[PDB]
Design a protein around this ligand. Structure first.
Ligand SMILES: Cc1cc2nc3c(=O)[nH]c(=O)nc-3n(C[C@H](O)[C@H](O)[C@H](O)COP(=O)(O)OP(=O)(O)OC[C@H]3O[C@@H](n4cnc5c(N)ncnc54)[C@H](O)[C@@H]3O)c2cc1C
Ligand SMILES: CCCCCCCCCCCCO[C@@H]1O[C@H](CO)[C@@H](O[C@H]2O[C@H](CO)[C@@H](O)[C@H](O)[C@H]2O)[C@H](O)[C@H]1O
Ligand SMILES: CCCCCCCCCCCCO[C@@H]1O[C@H](CO)[C@@H](O[C@H]2O[C@H](CO)[C@@H](O)[C@H](O)[C@H]2O)[C@H](O)[C@H]1O
Ligand SMILES: CCCCCCCCCCCCO[C@@H]1O[C@H](CO)[C@@H](O[C@H]2O[C@H](CO)[C@@H](O)[C@H](O)[C@H]2O)[C@H](O)[C@H]1O
Ligand SMILES: Cc1cc2nc3c(=O)[nH]c(=O)nc-3n(C[C@H](O)[C@H](O)[C@H](O)CO)c2cc1C
Ligand SMILES: N[C@@H](CCCC[NH3+])C(=O)O
Ligand code: FES
Ligand code: FES
Ligand SMILES: [K+]
Lengths: 407, 197, 380, 398, 203, 248
C-alpha cells in the first residue's frame, strides 16, 4: 500500500494546517465567553448572556419585558428597541416597519436582531415596569352576541397602574376548550343557535400570548373590567380553526384565574383643550369607556366630548346605562350609536347605518373645524380603514387621529 | 516586464466573469448595489490572490508528480486538496466580514459560504496547475483574475443601479433581466476574442 | 375641482425641443450618409460586374438578379457608363428592402410591447431602424435583417422597458447578433459589394494583410487613397463609407446639442492616442500598427459609430466627466480591436458595446467623488 | 466676486421699465395656504370676520407658534378649500385702517437687540413667515436658529424688478432690517447682490457678496451653495430684500409694512413697469386695464417659477415680487452652475430614489433651483414637483 | 408521504431559475442535450448522496469547518465516482471528462448541502438531491434543446433541421453556440416561470 | 469545541482519503491498461481499420500497423523498440528531449522529445498511410491527437483526438465525429512547405483546402489545436519527416 498510506498522512497534514489556521483565526477573531448587554445604561439592568439567540429572548429573561405581538417573525414591529451600539446595521425586513429617521435614533426589532456581540439598550420605564399578576375572574357575562365583559379581581390588592386606553397582555398555555362550555344568555344565544357556534372546539397547540385593552378607568379600584370578542373562523374561511385565546377566556366563569403580565399601551389622549371625538366598534368599547370615565371624574374635563359607537343591533349594544348617565350628568359629553342592521323587534328610531357615514352626515359634515379635534378610534378594520379615509378626506392630520385597532 | 502582460491577460483578455463565464452564480446574485458588489469583489480578490499562490506551492511541492518522493505522484489528491484550501480561506473570510458585516455578511448570506465552490476560484487554481506558473506568476495571475472578476461584478452592479430608472417587466425583474444583462455584458467583452496572450 | 398649487407651479414656458424633434434631427442627420451610401452601393456593384462579366454573360447575370433588371426596368443601366441616377437606384434596391424589413419587423416588436404593456409608442425606433439599416452590408439577406433588429429591439431595449430605459445600444446589439450568428453574411470578401460572384476585401481588411499598397479596388484596378475613404467611395456598410457625409450630419446634431461633443472628442482622443502609440511602437509583422490616426478616421465604421452611435445618450454616461472617459474608452477599444485583434478587421461596434458596459461605472466614480465634496461642504 | 457661467436668461418680451409707479388700487387680498411648505392651517377667522393689519388669520399645526397674519385690515370674504379641505386662500376685502402695532426701537439699538425679542415681534406680526429654511424651504421653527441668513438683494428671474430701484427708496429701512438680521443670525448675514451698489450695514456680521451671470445667479439656493452649503445639520434662512425692508419698518415704527413693488411685465403687458401693490394683492384686479386683449395667463412670480394666477390662487404669492402675463398657446448640465451631477440627480427624482437624491444634493435645492432643468428637458418632466415629492418623503420618513 | 419534494425543485424552487446556483455549468454543457443530460444525472446523483451523508453528520458538523467537511464529502464522492468509472466502463469515463471538477464546484451540490442537508433528515435530504438536479435539468435540457436545435440543427446529435453545409436548407445560428445565448435563454425561462408562477416575482 | 473539530476533521479526512487513495491507486492499473488499449483503437480508427474488442484490436493493430521511430531534427527513420516507445516520458527528460524557446513553442508544449514514434498503416506489404501523434496545450488540459497522413505526405486521411480533458460540449468536441470527419481531404501544407491547416473561428468556408471549422464557444481549445499543428508540422516537429514522405 504505497501512496495509499502516504497520501492519507499528507492529506491529513494539509487538512490540519488548514483547520489550524481557521482555529487560530477563530481564537483571534471570534469572541469567547459571554455577551454583556447594557439595559438603559444602568448596571443593575445590564444582562450578561452567552452568545447566540435573538435579543427578544434574552431581554424577556431579564427584569425588563419588551412588548411583542408577532413574536419571532419580525412582523408587528411593537418590539422596537434602541441599540446605541452593537447589533450592526438595520436589516431590510426591519426597515419595512422602522423608518430611516427612526433608524438614525437606533430603533431596531429585538426579535429580528440576533445577539452576537456586546450591545447597548435604553429601554424606558414602561417597558421596564411590567408586573405579573393573576387576577380572579368575577363575571364572564356576555355583553353582546360575540362580546363578553370580563371582570378581574386584583390578587395583590389596590389596582393595576396604567393609563387610559392601555392594555394588559394575557398569556395562556396549550389547552383544549369547547364552545359548548361557554354560558351565554338566551338574548345572545340566538345567532349562536342559528349557526351553532357551540359546535366549535378549540385546541391551542402551543402557549399563546395576546393583548386585551382595559375597560376600567384608573380611579376604578377592585375590579379590572375588560371586553373580549370571541374568535370564530373568518366569515370567508369557515375551513379555519376556531378561537384560541378569546375562546379560553369565554370558557371561564366565576372563580377562574388568569394572568395579566403587567400593563402596556401607547393609546392615550392629549392634555389640551381641543375637542375630543371617540369612534368605537365591537371590543373597542373597552378603551373608549376608560377614556370617557377618565375625562369625567379622573380629570373632570369641561372640554367637549363625543362618542360614536358602531353596533349591528340593539342586542349588540352594551354598557348603555353607564354612557347615558355620563351624558346626562355632564353635558360636555354626548354619546350616540347607530345600528348597521336593526332587528325587527328593536324598533330603533335613532341613527341607522355605519358610523363611517353617520358621524360625517350628522356632526363632521357641518363642523366648522373638523381638523381642530382629537380623534380616537378602535374597532373592526373595515370601520377603521373607512373612518380614517373619511377623516383624511376632511383634512385631519394623522397627528390628530390615534388608532388602536383590535382586528 | 512579462508580468504586466500576465496581469492584462487575467483582467481583460481572460476576464473570468465575462470572458470565461466562471463564478456566475455569485456574480448574478449579489450584483444589485455597487457598494455591496464592490465588497464582494474585494473579498474575491483577497481569496483568489491567496488561494492560487498557496495551492501553487502545495501542488509543486506536494501534489506535483515525483515531488515528495521519486515514483509517487499525488496528482489524484488535486481537487480534494485545492477545494479544501479554498474552503478554509472562505471560512476565515466569513469571520473577517464579522467586522465589515453590515455590507456583506447579511447581503451575501447563503452565498458567503459559497465563495468557495465558485467556478472562478477553483478554475483559477486549475489553470495554475494546468499551465505552469511560477510562484510570482501565480500571485500576478490570481490577483489579476480577481480584479477582472471584480471589474465585472462592480460593473454589473453599476448597470443595475442605473436600472433604477428602467421599467423591467415583472417576471424578468431581478434574476431574469440580470441574466440578459450579463449576456449583453459578455457580448461586449467578446472584443478581446482574437487577442492572443 | 380646484387642483393644488403643485399642479399650477409648472414651468410656464418650455423649450421647443422634445423627444420627437431630437429623433427626427438624428434621422435627418444620416440622410446625407444614407443617400451617398445608396449611390456608393450601386456604384461599387456596377463597377465589379463589368470587371467580372461582359457581353451576353453580363446580360444573363442582370437577368438572374431582381436587383439588376429592376434597375433596368425603371430606367437605369447596368453598363459602366451608368450615371448617378442608375447607381443610386441600384443601391436603393438593396437599402430600401433592408430598411423596410428592419422598420416593419422592429416596429412590430415596438408596438407589441407597448400594446401588451399599455405603453404609448416611442419615436426612438426611427433612429434605431435607420441606423441599423445603415450599418449592415448591402447584400445582407432580409431574413437576417429581421432577426438582427428583433434581437436589438427586444433583447437590448424592450425587455428593459423601452426607449430611455436600456443601457446597451440597440442597433449595435442587433448588428452584433448578426455578426456572431451569421458571420458569413456580414464578414469576408463576398458581402461588401453587391456584384454576385465577386470577391473583394474591404480597405481595413486589406491593410491588415499588406498595407496601403494593398488598398486597391479590385473591380477598378486603381488605388484607394485617403480621399477615397473620406468621401466614401469605398466598399463597406451602406452609410458608414462616407466620413464626409457623416460629419455633415454629425455637425448638425452636434450643433443642435443633440449629440455630445465630449463623447465625440473623447473618441477622437482615444483613437488618436492609441493609434499614434501603435505608430511609434511599430511592428515589423503587424501592418495595422502603422495606420495613422487620420486613416483610422475614414476607414470602417469608426466615423459612423463615433458620430451617430457612440452619441446614443441613453447608453452613454450621464456625467460630463464620464462622457470624456466613455468616448476615450471607445476610441481606445476600437483601435485595439482593429490592430491587435486578428479576428475582427473593425472593432467599432464591439468597442461601443464594451464601453456601454462601463459607462455606469465612470458615472458612479464621478458621482461618488461629488458626494465626498458635498459631505465636506466643498471646503467652505 | 462670484461669477456664474452655467445658466440661461430667457429673453421673453415685455421687460419692465424699472420705474416705480402706482398700480391699480387693490380692494381684495389673500394668503395662500398651499404656498407654505408643510403648512397645515389652524383657522383663527371665519367668513365675515373683520380683521386688522397684523391680526392672525391662521396657525401652522406642524410648525407651532408660527402666526400667519393679515396683510390688510378688512373683512374675510371667503376661505377657499380644495381636495381634503386644503386651505387654498383666505381672501380679505380691504377696508379701514385698523392695525396691530408693536414695539419700536432706535436704529442704533437694532443690531444690539436680544434675539428672543426679535423673534417674538416677527412671529407676532406675521413677518416670521418671510423666512424660509433652505434644506426644506419651510418657515423656520419659532425656537430654531440659523448661523447663516441669506438676503437675496438681486433678481435674475426673467422680467423681474430691479432690487436696487426698490431698495434705494427705503435705504434706512433696508439698513435697519440688516441690523436686525445681524442680531437674529447666530453667524453671519449674507447680502447676495449683483455688482450694483446698495446701502450697507455697519455690522461686521453683514457681508455683501456679488454674484454675476445668468438666471441662477440670483437664487438663494445658488448663493447658499457657494457661501454656506446646506445639509440636514447646516440650515440656512432665506429672505428677500423687500421683506428685509418690512423687517426694518417693523422694528423702527412698530408697524407691519405690507407694501411691495412688483414688476408687471410680459409680452401682453402694454406698459411693463414697476407697480406698487400690497402683499397677497388680487392679480385679477392688479392687471386690470394693463393687458392686451386675448386669452392671457397671469403668473404670480416669474415664468420659470411661479403660480398660475387663476381662481382661488389669483393672488400675489408671499414670496413672489413679480407678475408675468403671457398668451395661452446635455441640456441639464448647461443650466446648472452648482457642484452637482444634474442628469443623475434628476433621474433619481424621476425614479423616486429619495436616499440617492439626498446624496446628490437634493437637500440644497428648492423647486425654483430646478426650473431651468425643467425648461430645457426634452422629455418635458417637471422636476420642481418631483423634488418636492422627494423632499416631503425625506421629511416624512426622516 | 408524497413526491412533493422530488418534483417541487423542478418548477417551484428551481436551482437556476429561482435560486442562482449551478449557472456556471449551465452555460458550457447546454450546447448539447447529450452533455446536458449526463450533467443533470451527475448533479442528481452527487447532490443526493452528498446531501444524504451530510445529514448523517448534520448534528456533529462544526460551523468553523463545515464547508471543508461538506466539500470533502462532495469531492471524495466525485473523485471516487471518476476513479471507479475509469477502471470499469472506461468508455463512459472519458465522457465524465472535466465533469469531475464541474460537479464539485456546482453551487447546487454545496448549496443544498447547507440549506437542506445540514438541517434535515438524510432520507428527505437524499430526495432533495434528486429533486434539485431534476429542476437543474429542466433548465439545462430546455436551454440545450434550443441551443442545439437552432445552433446545429441537431438534437442529441440526430439531425432535425438539414444544414446547408450538408446540402440542406437551414443555416445554423452561431450565437446559440456561445455563452451569451444561454444567458438569454435562461433569463427568458425565468420570465416564463415567473409569469406562470407569479408567486416568485421579485419586489 | 477544539476537541470535536480536530477529531471530526481528522476522522473524516482519513476515511475519505483512504477511500480516494485506495480507489485511485488500485483502479489506476486497470485504468492504465484500459487507456493503453484505447490508443491502439484510436490508431486503427483513424487508419480506417475497423476493430472491436480489446483482443481483436491488439490482433489487428499488429497485423496492419507498423510503429517506427523518427528523429525530428533530421526527419529520418531510426532503430529502436517503437512498439514500446513512450514519447510522453522522453519529452520530460533533457537527454531525449529539448527545451523549446518562447518563439519556438507554438504548441505551448514545454518540451519536445528528440525521437517520436510514428505509425505506418500497411494494406499489404507497402505503407498506405502514416499516422502522426500531435499534441498541444489546450485551455483546460493537454490535447493529444492522431493524424492519418496519406503516402503523398500532404493529404490527410483521418483525424482523431485520443486524450483530451477539455469540457464536453465546448472543448471536448475534438471527439465529435462530424468535426473529425471534416479533416478528411484537407491539405496540411501550402506550396511553400509551410503549415496551412488553420482552425477558422466561426467556421471555415465550405470546401476549403486547409479550412477546419473551429470549436464553437471553445476558441482556446481550438487555439490549442492550431497551436498543436503549428508546432509539430514546423521545423522542430514532423516537418522534415513529411518532406521525406512526400518524395517516398
Ligand atoms: C393592544 C391590543 C388590544 C386588544 N384588545 C382586545 C380586546 O379587548 N378584545 C379582544 O377580543 N381582542 C383584543 N385584541 C386581540 C387579541 O390579541 C386577539 O386577537 C383576540 O383576543 C383573539 O385571540 P385568538 O388568538 O383566539 O385569535 P386568533 O386565533 O389569532 O384569530 C385568527 C382568526 O382565525 C381563527 N383562527 C384560529 N386559529 C387559527 C389559525 N391557526 N390559523 C388561521 N386562523 C385561525 C380564529 O377563530 C380567528 O377568527 C387586542 C390586541 C391588541 C394588540
Ligand atoms: C484639436 C483638433 C483635433 C484635430 C486632430 C488632432 C491632431 C492629432 C495629431 C496626432 C499626432 C500626429 O499624427 C501623426 O500622423 C502622421 C500622419 O499625418 C503619422 O505619420 C506616420 O508616422 C508613422 C511612424 O511614426 C508611420 O508608421 C505611418 O505611416 C504614419 O502614421 C505620425 O506617426 C503621427 O504622429
Ligand atoms: C475597462 C475600463 C474601465 C474599468 C476601469 C475604470 C473603472 C474603475 C471603477 C472601479 C470601481 C468603482 O469603484 C467605486 O469607487 C467608489 C468611489 O469612487 C466607491 O464609493 C464608495 O466606496 C465605499 C464602499 O467601499 C462607500 O463606503 C463610500 O460611501 C463610497 O465612496 C464604490 O463603492 C466603488 O465601487
Ligand atoms: C439568443 C438568440 C436569439 C433568439 C433568436 C434566434 C432564432 C434562430 C432561429 C431563426 C431561424 C432561421 O431560419 C431561417 O429561415 C430563413 C427564412 O427563409 C431561411 O432562409 C432561406 O430562405 C430565404 C428566402 O428564400 C433565402 O433568402 C435564404 O438565403 C435561405 O437561407 C434560412 O435558411 C433559415 O436559417
Ligand atoms: C444622438 C442620438 C443617437 C442615437 N443613436 C442610436 C444608436 O446608435 N442606436 C440605436 O439603436 N438608437 C439610437 N438612438 C435612439 C435611442 O436614443 C436609443 O435607442 C437609446 O438606447 C434608447 O432610447 C439615438 C438617439 C439619439 C438622440
Ligand atoms: N418593490 C419594488 C417594486 C416592485 C413592483 C411590484 N409590482 C420597489 O423597489
Ligand atoms: S415581535 Fe413583532 S417585530 Fe419583533
Ligand atoms: S459559481 Fe456557481 S456553478 Fe460556478
Ligand atoms: K484587426
Amino acid at each position: 500500500m504505497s501512496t495509499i498510506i502516504f497520501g492519507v498522512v499528507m492529506f491529513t497534514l494539509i487538512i490540519l494546517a488548514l483547520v489550524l489556521v481557521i482555529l487560530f483565526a477563530k481564537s483571534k477573531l471570534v469572541p469567547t465567553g459571554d455577551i454583556t448587554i447594557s439595559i438603559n445604561g444602568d448596571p443593575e439592568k445590564a444582562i450578561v448572556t452567552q452568545p447566540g439567540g435573538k435579543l427578544l429572548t434574552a431581554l424577556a429573561g431579564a427584569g425588563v419585558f419588551v412588548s411583542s405581538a408577532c413574536g419571532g417573525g419580525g412582523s408587528c414591529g411593537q418590539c422596537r428597541v434602541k441599540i446605541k451600539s452593537g447589533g450592526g446595521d438595520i436589516l431590510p425586513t426591519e426597515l419595512d416597519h422602522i423608518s430611516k429617521g427612526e433608524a438614525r435614533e437606533g430603533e431596531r426589532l429585538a426579535c429580528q436582531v440576533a445577539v452576537k456581540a456586546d450591545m447597548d439598550l435604553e429601554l424606558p420605564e414602561e417597558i421596564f415596569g411590567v408586573k405579573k399578576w393573576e387576577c380572579t375572574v368575577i363575571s364572564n357575562d356576555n355583553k353582546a352576541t360575540f362580546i363578553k365583559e370580563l371582570k378581574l379581581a386584583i390578587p395583590d390588592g389596590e389596582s393595576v397602574p396604567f393609563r387610559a386606553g392601555g392594555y394588559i397582555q394575557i398569556e395562556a398555555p396549550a389547552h383544549h376548550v369547547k364552545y359548548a362550555d361557554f354560558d351565554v344568555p338566551e338574548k345572545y344565544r340566538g345567532d349562536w343557535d342559528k349557526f351553532n357556534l357551540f359546535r366549535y372546539e378549540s385546541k391551542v397547540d402551543e402557549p399563546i400570548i395576546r393583548a386585551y385593552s382595559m375597560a376600567n378607568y384608573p380611579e376604578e379600584f377592585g375590579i379590572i373590567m375588560l371586553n373580549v370578542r370571541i374568535a370564530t373562523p373568518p366569515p370567508n374561511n369557515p375551513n379555519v380553526p376556531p378561537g384560541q385565546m378569546s375562546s379560553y377566556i369565554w370558557s371561564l366563569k366565576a372563580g377562574d384565574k388568569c394572568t395579566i403580565s403587567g400593563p402596556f399601551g401607547e393609546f392615550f389622549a392629549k392634555d389640551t383643550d381641543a375637542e375630543m371625538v371617540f369612534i368605537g366598534g365591537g371590543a373597542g368599547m373597552a378603551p373608549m369607556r376608560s377614556h370617557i370615565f377618565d375625562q369625567l371624574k379622573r380629570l373632570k374635563s369641561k372640554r367637549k366630548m363625543s362618542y360614536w359607537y358602531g353596533a349591528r343591533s340593539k342586542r349588540e349594544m352594551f354598557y348603555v346605562e353607564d354612557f347615558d348617565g355620563l351624558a346626562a350628568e355632564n353635558d360636555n359629553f354626548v354619546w350616540h350609536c347607530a345600528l348597521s342592521d336593526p332587528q325587527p323587534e328593536d324598533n330603533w328610531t335613532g341613527y341607522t347605518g355605519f358610523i363611517h357615514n353617520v358621524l360625517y352626515e350628522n356632526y363632521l359634515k357641518d363642523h366648522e373645524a373638523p381638523e381642530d379635534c382629537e380623534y380616537y378610534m378602535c374597532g373592526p378594520p373595515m370601520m377603521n380603514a373607512a373612518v380614517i379615509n373619511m377623516l383624511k378626506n376632511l383634512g385631519v392630520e394623522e397627528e390628530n387621529i390615534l388608532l388602536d385597532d383590535f382586528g | 516586464e512579462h508580468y504586466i502582460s500576465l496581469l492584462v491577460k487575467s483582467i481583460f483578455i481572460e476576464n473570468m466573469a465575462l470572458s470565461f463565464f466562471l463564478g456566475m452564480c455569485t456574480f448574478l446574485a449579489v450584483s444589485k448595489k455597487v457598494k455591496t458588489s464592490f465588497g464582494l469583489g474585494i473579498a474575491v480578490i483577497v481569496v483568489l490572490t491567496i488561494s492560487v499562490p498557496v495551492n501553487n506551492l502545495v501542488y509543486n511541492l506536494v501534489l506535483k508528480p515525483d515531488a515528495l518522493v521519486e515514483g509517487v505522484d499525488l496528482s489524484f489528491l488535486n481537487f480534494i486538496t485545492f477545494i479544501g484550501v479554498i474552503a478554509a480561506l472562505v471560512q476565515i473570510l466569513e469571520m473577517i466580514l464579522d467586522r465589515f458585516f453590515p455590507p456583506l455578511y447579511n447581503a451575501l448570506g447563503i452565498f458567503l459560504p459559497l465563495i468557495t465552490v465558485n467556478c472562478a476560484i477553483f478554475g483559477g487554481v486549475s489553470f495554475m496547475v494546468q499551465r505552469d506558473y511560477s510562484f510570482a506568476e501565480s500571485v500576478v495571475y490570481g490577483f489579476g483574475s480577481g480584479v477582472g472578476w471584480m471589474l465585472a461584478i462592480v460593473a454589473l452592479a453599476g448597470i443595475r443601479e442605473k436600472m433604477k430608472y428602467s421599467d423591467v417587466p415583472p417576471g424578468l425583474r431581478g434574476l431574469g433581466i440580470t441574466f440578459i444583462t450579463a449576456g449583453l455584458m459578455a457580448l461586449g467583452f467578446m472584443s478581446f476574442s482574437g487577442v492572443q496572450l | 375641482y380646484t387642483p393644488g398649487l403643485v399642479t399650477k407651479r409648472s414651468s410656464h414656458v418650455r423649450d421647443s425641443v422634445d423627444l420627437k424633434r431630437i429623433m427626427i434631427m438624428v434621422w435627418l442627420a444620416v440622410f446625407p450618409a444614407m443617400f451617398w451610401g445608396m449611390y456608393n452601393a450601386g456604384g461599387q456593384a456596377i463597377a465589379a460586374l463589368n470587371h467580372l462579366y461582359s457581353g451576353d454573360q453580363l446580360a444573363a447575370i442582370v437577368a438572374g438578379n431582381w436587383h439588376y433588371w429592376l434597375t433596368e426596368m425603371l430606367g437605369g443601366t447596368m453598363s459602366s457608363d451608368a450615371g448617378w441616377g442608375s447607381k443610386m437606384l441600384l443601391g436603393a434596391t438593396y437599402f430600401l428592402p433592408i430598411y423596410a424589413t428592419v422598420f416593419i419587423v422592429g416596429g412590430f416588436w415596438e408596438v407589441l410591447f407597448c400594446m401588451v404593456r399599455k405603453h404609448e409608442v416611442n419615436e426612438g425606433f426611427f433612429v434605431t431602424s435607420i441606423l441599423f439599416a445603415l450599418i449592415v452590408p448591402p447584400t445582407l439577406p432580409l431574413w437576417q435583417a429581421a432577426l438582427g433588429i428583433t434581437f436589438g429591439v427586444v433583447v437590448a431595449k424592450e425587455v428593459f422597458g423601452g426607449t430611455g430605459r436600456n443601457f446597451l445600444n440597440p442597433a449595435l446589439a442587433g448588428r452584433a447578433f448578426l455578426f456572431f450568428a451569421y458571420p458569413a453574411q456580414i464578414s469576408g470578401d463576398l458581402v461588401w459589394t453587391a456584384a454576385d460572384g465577386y470577391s473583394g476585401a474591404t480597405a481595413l481588411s486589406q491593410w491588415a494583410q499588406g498595407g496601403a499598397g494593398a488598398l486597391i479596388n479590385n473591380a477598378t484596378g486603381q488605388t484607394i487613397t485617403w480621399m477615397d475613404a473620406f468621401i466614401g467611395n469605398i466598399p463597406g456598410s451602406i452609410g458608414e463609407v462616407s466620413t464626409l457625409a457623416l460629419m455633415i450630419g454629425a455637425a448638425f446634431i452636434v450643433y443642435m446639442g443633440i449629440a455630445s461633443w465630449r463623447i465625440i472628442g473623447g473618441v477622437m482622443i482615444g483613437m488618436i492616442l492609441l493609434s499614434t502609440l501603435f505608430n511609434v511602437i511599430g511592428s515589423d509583422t503587424n501592418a495595422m500598427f502603422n495606420m495613422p490616426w487620420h486613416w483610422h478616421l475614414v476607414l470602417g465604421g469608426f466615423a459612423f459609430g463615433m458620430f451617430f452611435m457612440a452619441t446614443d445618450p441613453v447608453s452613454a454616461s450621464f456625467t460630463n466627466s464620464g462622457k470624456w472617459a466613455y468616448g476615450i474608452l471607445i476610441g481606445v477599444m476600437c483601435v485595439l480591436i482593429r490592430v491587435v485583434n486578428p479576428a475582427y478587421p473593425e472593432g467599432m461596434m464591439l468597442a461601443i458595446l464594451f464601453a456601454n458596459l462601463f459607462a455606469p461605472l465612470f458615472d458612479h466614480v464621478v458621482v461618488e467623488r461629488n458626494i465626498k465634496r458635498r459631505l465636506a461642504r466643498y471646503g467652505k | 466676486m462670484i461669477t456664474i457661467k452655467k445658466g440661461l436668461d430667457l429673453p421673453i418680451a415685455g421687460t419692465p421699465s424699472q420705474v416705480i409707479s402706482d398700480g391699480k388700487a387693490i380692494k381684495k387680498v389673500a394668503l395662500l395656504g398651499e404656498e407654505y411648505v408643510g403648512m397645515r392651517p389652524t383657522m383663527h377667522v371665519r367668513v365675515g370676520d373683520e380683521v386688522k393689519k397684523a391680526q392672525i388669520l391662521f396657525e401652522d399645526k406642524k410648525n407651532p407658534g408660527v402666526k400667519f397674519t393679515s396683510p390688510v385690515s378688512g373683512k374675510v370674504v371667503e376661505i377657499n378649500r380644495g381636495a381634503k379641505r386644503v386651505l387654498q386662500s383666505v381672501v380679505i376685502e380691504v377696508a379701514g385702517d385698523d392695525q396691530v402695532t408693536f414695539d419700536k426701537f432706535e436704529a442704533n439699538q437694532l443690531a444690539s437687540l436680544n434675539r428672543d425679542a426679535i423673534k417674538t415681534q416677527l412671529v407676532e406680526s406675521g413677518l416670521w413667515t418671510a423666512f424660509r429654511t433652505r434644506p426644506f424651504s419651510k418657515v423656520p421653527a419659532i425656537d430654531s436658529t440659523s448661523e447663516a441668513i441669506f438676503v437675496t438683494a438681486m433678481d435674475t428671474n426673467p422680467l423681474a424688478a430691479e432690487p436696487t430701484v426698490v431698495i434705494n427708496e427705503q435705504s434706512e429701512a433696508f439698513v435697519a432690517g440688516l441690523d436686525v438680521l445681524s442680531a437674529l443670525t447666530t453667524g453671519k448675514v449674507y447680502v447676495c447682490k449683483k455688482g450694483t451698489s446698495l446701502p450697507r450695514s455697519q455690522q461686521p456680521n453683514v457681508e455683501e457678496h456679488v454674484f454675476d451671470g445668468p438666471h441662477p445667479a440670483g437664487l438663494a439656493g445658488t448663493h447658499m451653495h457657494f457661501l454656506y452649503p446646506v445639509s440636514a445639520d447646516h440650515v440656512a434662512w432665506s429672505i428677500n430684500y423687500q421683506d428685509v425692508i418690512a423687517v426694518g419698518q417693523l422694528f423702527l415704527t412698530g408697524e407691519l409694512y405690507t407694501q411691495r413693488v412688483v414688476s408687471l411685465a410680459g409680452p401682453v403687458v402694454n406698459k411693463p413697469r414697476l407697480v406698487r401693490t400690497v402683499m397677497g394683492a388680487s392679480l385679477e384686479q392688479l392687471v386690470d386695464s394693463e393687458i392686451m386683449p386675448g386669452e392671457v395667463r397671469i403668473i404670480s412670480g416669474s415664468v420659470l417659477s411661479g403660480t398660475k394666477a387663476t381662481g382661488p390662487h389669483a393672488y400675489l404669492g408671499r414670496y413672489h415680487l413679480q407678475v408675468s402675463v403671457l398668451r395661452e398657446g446635455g441640456n441639464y448640465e448647461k443650466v446648472m452652475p452648482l457642484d452637482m451631477e444634474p442628469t443623475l440627480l434628476l433621474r433619481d427624482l424621476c425614479a423616486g430614489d429619495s436616499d440617492s437624491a439626498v446624496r446628490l444634493g437634493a437637500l440644497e435645492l428648492d423647486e425654483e433651483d430646478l426650473a431651468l432643468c425643467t425648461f430645457v428637458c426634452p422629455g418635458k418632466y417637471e422636476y420642481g414637483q418631483l423634488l418636492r415629492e422627494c423632499l416631503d418623503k425625506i421629511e416624512k420618513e426622516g | 408521504e408524497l413526491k412533493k419534494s422530488v418534483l417541487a425543485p423542478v418548477l417551484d424552487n428551481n436551482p437556476i431559475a429561482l435560486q442562482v446556483l449551478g449557472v456556471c455549468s449551465a452555460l458550457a454543457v447546454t450546447t448539447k442535450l447529450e452533455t446536458a443530460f449526463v450533467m443533470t444525472l451527475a448533479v442528481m446523483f452527487v447532490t443526493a448522496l452528498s446531501n444524504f451523508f451530510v445529514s448523517l453528520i448534520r448534528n456533529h458538523i462544526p460551523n468553523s469547518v463545515r464547508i471543508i467537511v461538506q466539500m470533502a464529502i462532495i469531492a471524495s464522492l466525485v473523485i471516487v465516482v471518476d476513479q471507479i468509472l475509469k477502471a470499469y466502463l472506461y468508455d463512459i469515463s472519458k465522457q465524465l471528462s472535466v465533469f469531475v471538477g464541474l460537479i464539485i464546484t456546482n453551487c447546487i451540490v454545496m448549496g443544498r448541502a447547507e440549506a437542506f442537508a445540514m438541517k434535515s433528515e438524510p432520507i428527505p435530504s437524499f430526495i432533495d438531491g434528486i429533486g434539485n438536479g431534476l429542476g437543474y435539468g429542466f433548465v439545462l435540457m430546455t436551454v440545450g434543446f434550443f441551443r442545439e436545435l437552432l445552433g446545429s440543427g441537431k438534437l442529441f446529435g440526430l439531425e432535425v433541421l438539414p444544414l446547408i453545409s450538408n446540402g440542406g436548407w437551414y443555416q445554423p445560428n452561431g450565437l446559440m453556440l456561445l455563452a451569451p445565448s444561454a444567458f438569454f435563454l435562461i433569463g427568458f425561462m425565468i420570465w416564463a416561470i415567473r409569469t406562470f408562477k407569479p408567486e416568485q416575482v421579485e419586489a | 469545541s477544539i476537541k470535536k473539530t480536530l477529531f471530526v476533521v481528522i476522522a473524516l479526512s482519513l476515511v475519505c482519503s483512504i477511500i480516494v487513495s485506495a480507489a485511485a491507486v488500485g483502479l489506476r492499473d486497470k485504468q492504465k491498461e484500459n487507456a493503453a488499449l484505447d490508443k491502439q483503437s484510436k490508431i486503427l480508427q483513424v487508419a480506417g481499420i475497423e476493430a472491436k474488442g480489446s483482443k481483436q484490436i491488439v490482433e489487428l493493430f499488429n497485423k496492419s500497423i507498423e510503429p517506427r521511430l523518427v528523429d525530428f531534427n533530421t526527419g529520418d527513420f531510426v532503430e529502436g523498440d517503437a512498439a514500446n516507445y513512450d514519447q510522453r516520458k522522453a519529452a520530460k527528460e533533457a537527454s531525449e528531449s529539448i527545451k523549446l524557446t518562447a518563439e519556438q513553442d507554438k504548441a505551448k508544449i514545454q518540451r519536445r522529445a528528440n525521437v517520436g514514434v510514428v505509425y505506418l498503416v500497411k494494406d499489404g506489404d507497402k505503407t498506405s498511410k502514416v499516422i502522426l501523434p500531435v499534441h498541444g496545450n489546450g485551455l483546460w488540459s493537454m490535447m493529444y491527437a492522431f493524424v492519418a497522413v496519406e503516402t503523398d505526405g500532404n493529404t490527410v486521411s483521418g483525424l482523431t483526438y485520443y486524450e483530451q480533458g477539455e469540457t464536453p460540449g465546448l472543448g471536448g468536441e475534438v471527439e465529435n465525429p462530424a468535426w473529425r470527419a471534416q479533416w478528411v481531404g484537407k491539405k496540411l501544407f501550402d506550396e511553400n512547405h509551410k503549415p496551412a491547416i488553420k482552425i477558422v473561428k466561426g467556421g471555415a468556408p465550405q470546401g476549403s483546402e486547409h479550412g477546419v471549422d473551429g470549436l464553437s464557444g471553445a476558441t482556446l481549445t481550438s487555439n490549442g489545436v492550431q497551436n498543436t499543428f503549428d508546432f509539430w508540422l514546423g521545423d522542430m516537429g514532423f516537418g522534415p519527416f513529411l518532406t521525406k514522405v512526400r518524395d517516398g
